[PDB]
Amino acid sequence: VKIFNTQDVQDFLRVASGLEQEGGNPRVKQIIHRVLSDLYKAIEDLNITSDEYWAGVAYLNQLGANQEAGLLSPGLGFDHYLDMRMDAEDAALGIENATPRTIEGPLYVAGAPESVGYARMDDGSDPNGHTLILHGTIFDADGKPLPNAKVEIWHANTKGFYSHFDPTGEQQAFNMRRSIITDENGQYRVRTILPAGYGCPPEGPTQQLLNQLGRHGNRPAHIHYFVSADGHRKLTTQINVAGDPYTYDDFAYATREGLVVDAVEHTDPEAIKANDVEGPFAEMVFDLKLTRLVDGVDNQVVDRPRLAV
Amino acid sequence: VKIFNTQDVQDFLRVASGLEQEGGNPRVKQIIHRVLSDLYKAIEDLNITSDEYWAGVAYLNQLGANQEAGLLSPGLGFDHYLDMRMDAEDAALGIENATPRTIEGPLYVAGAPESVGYARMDDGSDPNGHTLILHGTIFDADGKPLPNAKVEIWHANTKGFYSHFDPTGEQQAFNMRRSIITDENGQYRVRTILPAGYGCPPEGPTQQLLNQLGRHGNRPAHIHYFVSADGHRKLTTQINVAGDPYTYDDFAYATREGLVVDAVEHTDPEAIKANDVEGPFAEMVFDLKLTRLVDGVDNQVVDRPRLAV
Ligand SMILES: CCCCCCCCCCCCCCC(=O)OC[C@H](COP(=O)(O)OCC[N+](C)(C)C)OC(=O)CCCCCCCCC
Numbered sequence: 181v182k183i184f185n186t187q188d189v190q191d192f193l194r195v196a197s198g199l200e201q202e203g204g205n206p207r208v209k210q211i212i213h214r215v216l217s218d219l220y221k222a223i224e225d226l227n228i229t230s231d232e233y234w235a236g237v238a239y240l241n242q243l244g245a246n247q248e249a250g251l252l253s254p255g256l257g258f259d260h261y262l263d264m265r266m267d268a269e270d271a272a273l274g275i276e277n278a279t280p281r282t283i284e285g286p287l288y289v290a291g292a293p294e295s296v297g298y299a300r301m302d303d304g305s306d307p308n309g310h311t312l313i314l315h316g317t318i319f320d321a322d323g324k325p326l327p328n329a330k331v332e333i334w335h336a337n338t339k340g341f342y343s344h345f346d347p348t349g350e351q352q353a354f355n356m357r358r359s360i361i362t363d364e365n366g367q368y369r370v371r372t373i374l375p376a377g378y379g380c381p382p383e384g385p386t387q388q389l390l391n392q393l394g395r396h397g398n399r400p401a402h403i404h405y406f407v408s409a410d411g412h413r414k415l416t417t418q419i420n421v422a423g424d425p426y427t428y429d430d431f432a433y434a435t436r437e438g439l440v441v442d443a444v445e446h447t448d449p450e451a452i453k454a455n456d457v458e459g460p461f462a463e464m465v466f467d468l469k470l471t472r473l474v475d476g477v478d479n480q481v482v483d484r485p486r487l488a489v
Numbered sequence: 490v491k492i493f494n495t496q497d498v499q500d501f502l503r504v505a506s507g508l509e510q511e512g513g514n515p516r517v518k519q520i521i522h523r524v525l526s527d528l529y530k531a532i533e534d535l536n537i538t539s540d541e542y543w544a545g546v547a548y549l550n551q552l553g554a555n556q557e558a559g560l561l562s563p564g565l566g567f568d569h570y571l572d573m574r575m576d577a578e579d580a581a582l583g584i585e586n587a588t589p590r591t592i593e594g595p596l597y598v599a600g601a602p603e604s605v606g607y608a609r610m611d612d613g614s615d616p617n618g619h620t621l622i623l624h625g626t627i628f629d630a631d632g633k634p635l636p637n638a639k640v641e642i643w644h645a646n647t648k649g650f651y652s653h654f655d656p657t658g659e660q661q662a663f664n665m666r667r668s669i670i671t672d673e674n675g676q677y678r679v680r681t682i683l684p685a686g687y688g689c690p691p692e693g694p695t696q697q698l699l700n701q702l703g704r705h706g707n708r709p710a711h712i713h714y715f716v717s718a719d720g721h722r723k724l725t726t727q728i729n730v731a732g733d734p735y736t737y738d739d740f741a742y743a744t745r746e747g748l749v750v751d752a753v754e755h756t757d758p759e760a761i762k763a764n765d766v767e768g769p770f771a772e773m774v775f776d777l778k779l780t781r782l783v784d785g786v787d788n789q790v791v792d793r794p795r796l797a798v
């Protein structure tokens with residue numbers, strides 16, 4: 181029993197897609213037509229039954245009901261896949277991406293407090309918080325320190341929860357989220373705490389599909405970065421805290437060579453005093469290099485729905 | 490950019506699909522692998538940008554957020570495609586389906602009160618409801634009246650809402666929903682009102698997408714049926730009220746030849762008195778013929794999530 185490649189189904193696909201329809205958006209029709217064709221065929225090829233089909237439909241409802249589509253997306257490799265395509269294009273244009281890009285993740289929040297050169301991003305509400313001095317230099321496309329660059333950083337606390345997405349509703353707005361404008365020396369410096377890794381909500385749809393694939397839904401500890409500056413393309417990346425069990429086994433496949441950074445521990449009272457800290461602290465250094473706009477155009481910025489508070 | 494056919498992407502797809510993992514469900518992985526492959530390839534062939542991709546992801550959260558996955562499904566023709574497969578299968582098996590099947594729709598509710606032979610389906614809460622006397626005979630696979638058959642019926646009121654899915658939340662439990670056991674003659678008879686067609690929620694995700702395809706989200710007036718009986722397969726079908734502007738332009742493509750029925754208008758005082766009505770009423774007669782089980786089993790019953798009350 182095969183009917184996909186019969187005139188009836190083929191003409192039906194054009195109808196359902198609004199192809200012969202006058203109004204509408206041709207780009208959407210084009211994509212829908214292709215998607216539907218593939219799904220109708222996959223249904224026949226894999227002999228998907230109605231029982232299976234409807235199970236799939238129910239999954240989509242609960243996926244959206246839990247607002248987890250942006251979480252399952254990276255878990256199924258789409259996010260990394262899109263970065264791969266962007267790298268391939270940059271390679272085509274002859275652009276050398278000094279600091280490699282990686283996925284943004286679905287937890288960015290716009291509207292964080294902004295300051296120049298330095299900033300403390302945690303509010304101390306975290307008990308297990310281990311002080312972390314993260315700092316580096318921002319280089320323009322010519323390798324020269326770039327003053328006035330906007331560095332945006334966001335990460336989870338020791339429980340693996342981000343502010344605005346903390347189920348305990350324990351965090352104040354923008355905790356561990358800050359924008360730092362680079363100083364006269366193109367430097368940024370922040371005092372925060374070592375983030376903990378985290379996984380998908382165990383009861384959530386993303387995690388349960390993952391179970392069906394025999395995969396886990398964990399991410400190693402990391403720190404997200406957005407770096408933008410005049411005449412430069414917006415850099416999206418993150419750094420992985422070296423030593424994490426899932427550094428090279430992140431369910432979001434975001435890890436890359438050059439993004440893994442070692443956290444140096446300092447117990448020496450001489451260090452603890454230079455860096456106005458109360459006691460032992462970890463230190464991480466990470467410089468990032470930006471690329472120029474391609475003819476006054478940032479050909480890789482992504483306009484995507486992002487929570488703004 | 491062409492990287493889909495590279496070993497890097499191909500292996501990645503197998504990893505994301507968990508094909509390499511030992512745990513999980515092999516059937517699920519098999520499907521996931523195929524779907525991701527097709528989508529990844531589709532993203533390449535159609536050069537889908539990140540901006541486009543993320544709009545698609547946002548749309549999905551939206552769809553599930555409004556619980557409209559089962560409404561978009563029929564709109565994109567899946568529901569009908571599955572029926573077509575079922576007909577092809579029966580055809581290959583030499584089963585000529587006297588009463589053509591059609592889609593069930595996402596609005597069935599299990600638990601309706603049942604009675605033998607007769608029942609009034611509505612509670613008269615509809616101001617503009619027009620009385621309808623609906624009746625017919627259920628015939629077995631041999632063409633003989635089938636007493637004890639279970640006829641399940643559900644439909645909307647004049648505003649196009651079904652009980653349990655009324656936005657204006659205005660209906661008595663199971664209003665216009667009933668189960669009837671055919672009498673000593675395989676007959677069923679109900680008193681209710683003529684349903685009005687209905688469209689998808691105007692501001693909902695299903696309608697938003699249909700607009701992009703230049704299509705409407707309307708269904709002609711219709712009445713849903715479920716007919717089951719020992720020794721026979723469960724029949725899912727419906728009847729279309731003849732004369733509806735959308736009779737042959739249903740956005741869910743459920744209309745089939747032989748399911749369009751004429752509602753006969755009675756106004757003469759004798760018809761009014763015979764049928765214990767209190768004024769002019771419409772009458773529709775519809776007989777259904779069931780098919781036999783295939784080697785002891787119903788090879789086409791569908792088990793899908795259905796609201797139960
Ligand atoms: C609007 C357009 C709709 C498009 C949807 C089309 C998809 C069609 C493919 C459907 C594939 C689902 C089939 C899988 C299946 O038959 O069952 C899936 C599992 C169930 O677990 P079991 O143990 O097998 O249940 C059974 C327990 N018993 C044995 C005891 C009864 O549940 C799940 O959620 C896994 C399903 C998630 C698949 C999502 C793919 C989307 C990719 C982005």
Ligand SMILES: CCCCCCCCCCCCCCC(=O)OC[C@H](COP(=O)(O)OCC[N+](C)(C)C)OC(=O)CCCCCCCCC
Pocket residue numbers: 205207208211215249252253256258528537540541542544545546548549697698701
């Ligand atoms: C986790 C796995 C997820 C995998 C997802 C795979 C799908 C990826 C392909 C989707 C591509 C989407 C392209 C659609 C698009 O580029 O724009 C779609 C419309 C927007 O209309 P505009 O007028 O352009 O908006 C702008 C108006 N302004 C300019 C005035 C601001 O919005 C919409 O919601 C329509 C989107 C429909 C796509 C849903 C497909 C699902 C069906 C099975």
Ligand SMILES: [Fe+3]
Pocket residue numbers: 285287402404
């Ligand atoms: Fe993160």
Ligand SMILES: [Fe+3]
Pocket residue numbers: 594596644711713
């Ligand atoms: Fe209906």
